[PDB]
RNA sequence: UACAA
RNA sequence: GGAGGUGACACAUGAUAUA
RNA sequence: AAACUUGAGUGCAGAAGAGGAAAGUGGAAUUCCAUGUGUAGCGGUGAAAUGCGCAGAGAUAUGGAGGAACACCAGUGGCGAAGGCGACUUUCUGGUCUGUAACUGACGCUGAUGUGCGAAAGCGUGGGGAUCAAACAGGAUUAGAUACCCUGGUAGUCCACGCCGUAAACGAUGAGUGCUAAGUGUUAGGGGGCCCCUUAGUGCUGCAGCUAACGCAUUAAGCACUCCGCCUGGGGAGU
């Protein structure tokens, strides 16, 4: 059955991005909402809408493509996994693509990026790399 | 000029441009402003050789009769798409046309 | 709970007045143990599509039963086997 | 409708001149109808209503 | 194995409230009657391996429902255990 | 070709 | 045109590398 | 700790099926037996011969015995976890699919050890014995022919109950879950106006992607997460 809803979200984005879809819908959760907003804030996706329903909510994402239909998102990668959880300290926060990408980190001050985690001197669970 | 090919063969990339399928007459008009014999392999990519036959045509009767007649279009696009405008029906690929006219 | 559609064939050379001796009896057997007969029928002489026991015709008989135990139709099938008057039979669950 | 093995006149239409069951690609019957047809014909053959081989 | 009339008898007896057909007690009770009936079938049909595979699935489903009931409210679980002829 | 027989 | 199912007398042998 | 209903189960309403076990009924054919007609070969092969036949064969007609298997239907059709399952009838019984949204409220997935099922051959006990047929015999072929071909023929092939536990047991593709162009057949349903939409199977073609290539491609060999099994040059040796 479903074991990693976050990796399912990152893969839904990867598959939709591969075929250059305009948008995609997925069932919602709090961390998936916060992951999506960071992608919006960092400029990887266009917009996030939340659609309420009886079951668990729906997240609508809008993908971004530049001139000549070049993909803004190049890749997504799940780092921490149910089979093997990955944690890091602020002093060992990984840089993604030499700083040209981002790492999503779940810290005790919420879900933030790696550049901000070093700024706040907090570590936590490395959710995913986006570049 | 806006009735395309049958549904059982329509390419999926013409959905925006599209019983049988009817072309987007409204979209073709805005696109039209933005825009007989066999095609020899290497007409454009082998001009270093075709021009010799073009020159030899300008300069025997059996050759000229076929040469005059000579000098579906997938050969031509490759000779141009590899070098880095045309009517594009539903069955035709739109992703390889710089100025696609979605008219039948 | 169940309805059956018993059919059987009686040999064609039988004496006429002896035929009611078994049809009443075989229907009687088809009614013991809570087996209310819904309907009895009697088709006429029919030309069998092929020879059965070197016979060419037979008396087709249809009996419809309403039981919930099927031991009534088991008794019919047991009796029809050893009776030389009946030459072919079949029980069918209608529903 | 449910095909009855007693209805020999309906059944004869689906057998051939040697008493063989006709393929459905020939008679145009559907798949579920042909299955009901086959059971009724085999039942009717047993009760001598239809021949096995004529 | 069991009729709709016998199933509805069992549902009426073991339901934890009216219009309840999905509680563990209802499911375990119905599974118990079905398991007993197939065991009756398999006593004279010892060679019916295919039916016995289906019985083994019922036993596994009953055991899982019992485990869930035990870990959620042991009082309901132990009252159901005596009601049926079930050990553990 | 150098061998083997 | 290309696939998948279906069906359909006798004749032995020739060393090693290098070729 | 407390809620939730989407996952997973239950209920209700429909439907399809060679799914399994047991017991009955039937038609064709093979073999054998008897009887009637009837006479010189039948059979078999590349060609032959062995073999059967004038003591009456083979052929033909009728009848009987017996075992085994179920033409047509029959279809990349159906069912089953796999092995497998095909005449019909009854009895007992397993699973799946569709619709609904009564109900329970994460009760799930995978699964070492374990425990079961598991083609065929084979083994034990006892039955049965038509056909076919290892071994074997004879006849051919051949330089030889422990073969291929022919005439026979035992185990076995069949049943019951035990055992055996292996196959190219194969899609040579572990299970679960989700996501990712289309086109077109087919099986079982549902909804709406023969067509359109939609479930679940089963096929073909074909993008993106993947691949060493062949190819795979919503039934992935694509993109992901979980669990299990397995691999680490060939031979020796599955010894
Ligand atoms: Mg039902
Ligand atoms: Mg079903
Ligand atoms: Mg499991
Ligand atoms: Mg194991
Ligand atoms: Mg065997
Ligand atoms: Mg032989
Ligand atoms: Mg034996
Ligand atoms: Mg056995
Ligand atoms: Mg293997
Ligand atoms: Mg898989
Ligand atoms: Mg998948
Ligand atoms: Mg393909
Ligand atoms: Mg499909």
The parent domain of residue A101 ranges over 74-131
DSSP three-state, residue E53:
helix
Residues from chain D contacting residue C42 (CB–CB below 8 Å):
none
- The two tokens of residue B53 are 């036959």
Out of C49, C88, C90, the one facing D51 most closely (by C-beta) is: C49
Secondary-structure breakdown of chain C: helix, strand, coil percentages, each rounded to the nearest 5: 25, 45, 30
Residues 6+ apart with CB under 8 A from A26: A8, A9, A12, A32, A58, A59, A61
CATH of C4-93, one of 4.10.95.10, 3.40.190.10, 3.30.70.60, 3.40.50.720: 3.30.70.60
Containing structural domain, residue E75: 1-88
Residue C17, judged by CB atoms within 10 A of its CB (0-12, 13-18, 19+), counts as exposed
A36-57 exposure pattern, b = at least 16 Cβ within 10 A, e = fewer: bebbeeeebbeebeeeeeeeeb
Please give the DSSP secondary-structure letter assigned to residue B38.
P
DSSP lists the bridge partners of residue A107 as A110, A124
Q: Is D3 left (phi over 0), alpha (psi -120 to 50) or beta?
A: beta
Query: Residue B28 has what DSSP assignment?
Result: H
Domain span at residue B48 reads: 40-71
Nearest to D48 among C52, C62, C92 (CB): C52
Query: Is the CB of residue C3 less than 8 Å from the CB of residue C63?
Result: no
Place of tokens 């696109």: B31
Report d(CA A18, CA A74) in Å as an integer.
Answer: 9
Enumerate the nucleotides of strand H whose atoms come under 7 Å of any protein CB. 4-13, 16-22, 24-28, 63, 71-75, 77, 80-83, 87-95, 102-109, 116-118, 161-162, 176-184, 186-189, 208-209, 222-227
E70: left (phi over 0), alpha (psi -120 to 50) or beta: alpha
From D44, which residue of chain C is nearest by alpha-carbon distance? C49
Question: Do A4 and A41 share a structural domain?
Answer: yes
Using the structure, give the distance in angstroms from the CA atom of C67 to the C1' atom of H167, rounded to a whole number. 51
- Give the method of determination: cryo-EM
Which residues sit opposite C55 in a β-bridge?
Answer: C52
Could you tell me the resolution of this structure in angstroms? 2.2
Q: What is the tally of structural domains in chain E? A: 1
Q: Let me know whether A61 and A78 are in one domain.
A: no
Cα→Cα distances C37→A129, C1, C3, C34, C59, Å: 79, 13, 10, 9, 19
Number of domains chain A contains: 2
Please list the alpha-helical segments (H only) found in E45-73: 49-72
Structure tokens given for B29: 């008009």
Measure Cα distances from A35 to A104, A111, A125, A129, C15 in Å.
7, 7, 13, 11, 95
User: Could you tell me if A95 and A125 lie in one domain?
Assistant: yes
Q: Are C44 and C62 in contact (CB under 8 A)?
A: no
Residue C38 corresponds to which tokens in the numbers above?
A: 């819904």
């Amino acid at each position: 059955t479903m074991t990693d809803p976050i990796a399912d979200m990152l893969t839904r984005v990867r598959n939709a991005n591969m075929v250059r879809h305009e948008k995609l819908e997925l069932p919602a959760s709090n961390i998936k909402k916060e992951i999506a907003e960071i992608l919006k804030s960092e400029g990887f996706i266009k917009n996030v809408e939340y659609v309420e329903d009886d079951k668990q909510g729906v997240l609508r994402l809008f993908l971004k493509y530049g001139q000549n239909d070049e993909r803004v998102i190049t890749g997504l990668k799940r780092i921490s996994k149910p089979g093997l959880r990955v944690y890091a300290k602020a002093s060992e926060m990984p840089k993604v693509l030499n700083g040209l990408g981002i790492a999503l980190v779940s810290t005790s001050e919420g879900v933030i990026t790696d550049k901000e985690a070093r700024k706040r001197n907090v570590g936590g669970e490395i959710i995913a790399y986006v570049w | 000029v806006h009735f395309g090919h049958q549904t059982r063969r329509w390419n999926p990339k013409m959905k925006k441009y599209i019983g049988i399928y009817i072309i987007d007459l409204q979209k073709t008009v805005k696109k039209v402003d933005e825009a007989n014999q066999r095609w020899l392999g290497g007409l454009l990519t082998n001009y270093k050789t075709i021009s010799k036959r073009i020159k030899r045509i300008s300069e025997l009767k059996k050759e000229y009769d076929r040469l005059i007649k000579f000098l579906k279009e997938r050969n031509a696009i490759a000779e141009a798409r590899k070098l880095n405008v045309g009517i594009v029906d539903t069955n035709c690929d739109p992703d390889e046309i710089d100025y696609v006219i979605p008219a039948n | 709970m169940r309805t059956y559609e018993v059919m059987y064939i009686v040999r064609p050379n039988i004496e006429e007045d002896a035929k009611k001796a078994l049809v009443e009896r075989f229907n009687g057997i088809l009614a013991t143990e809570g087996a209310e007969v819904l309907e009895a029928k009697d088709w006429g002489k029919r030309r069998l599509a092929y020879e059965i026991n070197d016979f060419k015709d037979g008396f087709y008989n249809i009996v419809r039963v309403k039981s919930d135990n099927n031991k009534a139709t088991d008794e019919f099938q047991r009796l029809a086997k050893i009776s030389d008057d009946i030459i072919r039979y079949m029980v069918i669950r209608e529903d | 409708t449910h095909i009855d093995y007693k209805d020999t006149e309906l059944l004869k239409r689906f057998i051939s001149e040697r008493g063989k069951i006709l393929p459905r690609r020939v008679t145009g019957t559907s798949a579920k109808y042909q299955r009901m047809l086959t059971t009724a014909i085999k039942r009717s053959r047993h009760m001598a209503l239809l021949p096995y081989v004529k | 194995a069991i009729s709709q009339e016998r199933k509805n008898e069992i549902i009426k007896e073991y339901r934890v409230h009216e219009t309840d057909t999905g509680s563990p007690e209802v499911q375990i009770a119905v599974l118990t009657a079905e398991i007993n009936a197939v065991n009756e079938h398999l006593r004279t049909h010892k060679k019916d391996h295919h039916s016995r595979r289906g019985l083994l699935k019922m036993v596994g489903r009953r055991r899982h429902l019992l485990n869930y009931l035990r870990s959620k409210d042991i009082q309901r679980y132990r009252e159901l255990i005596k009601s049926l002829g079930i050990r553990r």
